[PDB]
Design a protein that fits this description.
It is built from three helices and no strands. By secondary structure, the protein is mainly α. Helix 2 packs across helix 3. The structure holds one DNA strand. This is RNA polymerase sigma factor SigA.
Length: 78
DNA sequence: ATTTTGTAGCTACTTATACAAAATTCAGGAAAATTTTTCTGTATAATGGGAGCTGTCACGGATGCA
Protein backbone atom coordinates (compact mmCIF):
# COMPACT_ATOMS: atom_id res chain seq x y z
CA UNK A 1 0.00 0.00 0.00
CA UNK A 2 3.07 2.28 -0.40
CA UNK A 3 0.94 4.32 -2.88
CA UNK A 4 4.04 6.39 -3.84
CA UNK A 5 5.78 3.12 -4.74
CA UNK A 6 2.47 1.44 -5.77
CA UNK A 7 2.58 4.02 -8.61
CA UNK A 8 6.42 4.16 -8.71
CA UNK A 9 6.53 0.49 -9.58
CA UNK A 10 4.44 0.74 -12.29
CA UNK A 11 5.78 3.76 -13.89
CA UNK A 12 8.92 1.89 -13.92
CA UNK A 13 7.17 -0.37 -16.15
CA UNK A 14 7.11 2.14 -18.74
CA UNK A 15 10.40 2.78 -20.26
CA UNK A 16 12.46 5.72 -20.98
CA UNK A 17 13.15 7.19 -24.42
CA UNK A 18 15.67 9.38 -26.32
CA UNK A 19 15.53 12.70 -28.27
CA UNK A 20 15.23 10.92 -31.67
CA UNK A 21 12.45 8.66 -30.27
CA UNK A 22 10.85 11.79 -28.70
CA UNK A 23 11.22 13.61 -32.09
CA UNK A 24 8.72 11.48 -34.04
CA UNK A 25 6.63 12.67 -31.32
CA UNK A 26 7.18 16.20 -31.40
CA UNK A 27 5.90 16.59 -34.89
CA UNK A 28 2.83 14.32 -34.28
CA UNK A 29 1.99 16.27 -31.07
CA UNK A 30 2.11 19.56 -33.06
CA UNK A 31 0.22 17.82 -35.94
CA UNK A 32 -2.58 17.24 -33.37
CA UNK A 33 -2.11 20.42 -31.49
CA UNK A 34 -2.55 22.79 -34.20
CA UNK A 35 -5.23 20.75 -35.68
CA UNK A 36 -7.33 21.44 -32.88
CA UNK A 37 -6.87 25.05 -32.80
CA UNK A 38 -8.43 24.86 -35.99
CA UNK A 39 -11.07 23.21 -34.09
CA UNK A 40 -11.27 26.14 -31.88
CA UNK A 41 -11.10 28.65 -34.66
CA UNK A 42 -13.96 27.10 -36.28
CA UNK A 43 -15.44 27.02 -32.91
CA UNK A 44 -15.18 30.60 -32.18
CA UNK A 45 -16.36 31.78 -35.47
CA UNK A 46 -19.19 29.46 -35.69
CA UNK A 47 -21.80 27.32 -34.04
CA UNK A 48 -19.15 27.86 -31.39
CA UNK A 49 -17.48 24.64 -32.55
CA UNK A 50 -17.07 22.72 -35.82
CA UNK A 51 -17.53 19.83 -33.56
CA UNK A 52 -19.56 17.97 -36.07
CA UNK A 53 -17.56 15.60 -38.24
CA UNK A 54 -14.86 15.78 -40.82
CA UNK A 55 -16.31 19.09 -40.32
CA UNK A 56 -15.73 18.96 -36.68
CA UNK A 57 -12.90 20.17 -38.67
CA UNK A 58 -13.35 22.76 -41.23
CA UNK A 59 -10.49 20.96 -42.60
CA UNK A 60 -10.75 18.40 -45.25
CA UNK A 61 -10.09 14.84 -44.27
CA UNK A 62 -11.51 11.47 -44.82
CA UNK A 63 -13.24 11.37 -41.65
CA UNK A 64 -12.03 8.15 -40.12
CA UNK A 65 -8.53 9.22 -40.82
CA UNK A 66 -9.19 12.43 -38.94
CA UNK A 67 -9.93 10.82 -35.54
CA UNK A 68 -6.92 8.58 -36.37
CA UNK A 69 -4.60 11.56 -37.10
CA UNK A 70 -5.93 13.05 -33.82
CA UNK A 71 -5.15 9.79 -31.93
CA UNK A 72 -1.50 9.56 -33.14
CA UNK A 73 -1.03 13.35 -32.78
CA UNK A 74 -2.03 13.43 -29.08
CA UNK A 75 -1.11 9.77 -28.30
CA UNK A 76 2.45 11.13 -28.80
CA UNK A 77 1.96 13.54 -25.84
CA UNK A 78 0.29 10.80 -23.72
C1' DA B 1 -63.39 105.24 51.36
C1' DT B 2 -59.99 102.46 49.61
C1' DT B 3 -60.02 98.40 48.15
C1' DT B 4 -60.78 94.74 46.74
C1' DT B 5 -64.23 92.99 44.56
C1' DG B 6 -66.55 93.36 39.16
C1' DT B 7 -68.12 93.03 35.22
C1' DA B 8 -68.39 93.58 31.50
C1' DG B 9 -65.01 94.67 29.08
C1' DC B 10 -62.21 95.58 25.25
C1' DT B 11 -57.74 95.64 23.34
C1' DA B 12 -53.22 94.03 22.74
C1' DC B 13 -51.51 90.07 22.73
C1' DT B 14 -49.62 85.50 22.23
C1' DT B 15 -49.85 81.19 21.52
C1' DA B 16 -51.18 77.38 17.69
C1' DT B 17 -51.16 75.67 12.53
C1' DA B 18 -49.74 74.40 9.33
C1' DC B 19 -46.70 74.93 5.50
C1' DA B 20 -42.55 75.54 3.73
C1' DA B 21 -39.17 76.33 1.53
C1' DA B 22 -35.47 76.60 2.41
C1' DA B 23 -31.67 74.90 4.70
C1' DT B 24 -28.64 71.38 5.54
C1' DT B 25 -26.95 67.84 6.12
C1' DC B 26 -25.92 62.58 4.32
C1' DA B 27 -25.40 58.44 1.72
C1' DG B 28 -24.28 56.15 -2.05
C1' DG B 29 -22.23 56.12 -6.34
C1' DA B 30 -19.46 56.40 -8.83
C1' DA B 31 -15.29 56.64 -9.88
C1' DA B 32 -11.43 56.45 -10.34
C1' DA B 33 -7.48 55.63 -8.60
C1' DT B 34 -4.54 52.39 -7.13
C1' DT B 35 -3.03 48.92 -4.72
C1' DT B 36 -2.89 43.87 -4.53
C1' DT B 37 -3.61 39.98 -6.44
C1' DT B 38 -2.99 36.82 -10.27
C1' DC B 39 -0.58 34.73 -14.42
C1' DT B 40 3.30 32.80 -17.15
C1' DG B 41 7.99 31.83 -18.29
C1' DT B 42 12.46 30.03 -17.54
C1' DA B 43 16.34 26.52 -22.40
C1' DT B 44 23.30 23.31 -21.01
C1' DA B 45 21.12 18.84 -18.29
C1' DA B 46 18.82 16.76 -14.63
C1' DT B 47 15.01 10.52 -14.79
C1' DG B 48 12.53 5.89 -8.14
C1' DG B 49 11.78 7.84 -1.08
C1' DG B 50 12.07 7.35 3.97
C1' DA B 51 11.98 4.72 7.86
C1' DG B 52 13.30 1.24 11.58
C1' DC B 53 9.87 -0.51 14.14
C1' DT B 54 10.95 -4.11 16.17
C1' DG B 55 7.87 -6.30 24.15
C1' DT B 56 -0.30 -7.38 25.16
C1' DC B 57 -4.56 -9.21 22.31
C1' DA B 58 -7.76 -11.98 20.13
C1' DC B 59 -10.12 -13.58 17.88
C1' DG B 60 -11.91 -15.19 15.12
C1' DG B 61 -10.09 -16.71 11.80
C1' DA B 62 -7.56 -19.27 10.22
C1' DT B 63 -7.77 -19.79 5.47
C1' DG B 64 -4.82 -22.96 4.88
C1' DC B 65 -3.17 -26.81 5.77
C1' DA B 66 -0.34 -30.65 5.77
Amino acid sequence: EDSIRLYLQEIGRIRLLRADEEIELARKIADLLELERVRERLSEKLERDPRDSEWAEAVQLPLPAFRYRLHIGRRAKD
